[model samples]
Target: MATTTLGVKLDDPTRERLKAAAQSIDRTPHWLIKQAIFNYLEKLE
Candidate 1:
């Protein structure tokens, strides 16, 4: 699979929330973010 990098800045609390949510699902924060972006893109089609 091909992969790309994304960068963003969030408040500390938001960053911590992503970290905790990802940990709960046993996924990296990047994976969660990518999944969300893909879902949104699919909805637009």
Candidate 2:
């Protein structure tokens, strides 16, 4: 599959939560975001 970049906007607290959750799962914030996107899309479908 092709890859691309995504620009994201989040408040400071949101960013911190993303960082913390990603750490707890031993993954990068980018990885968590992609997982979240996939899960949300799957739910809709």
| Model 1 C-alpha RMSD to native | 3.1
Candidate 1: give the clashing pairs: none
Q: Write the per-residue lDDT of candidate 2 for residues 1-45, one digit (tens) a residue.
A: 344767878678887787776776678887766655664688698
Query: How do the residues 1-45 of candidate 1 rate in per-residue lDDT, one tens digit apiece?
Result: 465775766677787787775776678887766655674588696
For each candidate in the order shown, give its overall lDDT on alpha carbons: 0.68, 0.70
TM-score of 1: 0.44
Query: What would the TM-scores of all predictions be?
Result: 0.44, 0.51
lDDT of 1: 0.68
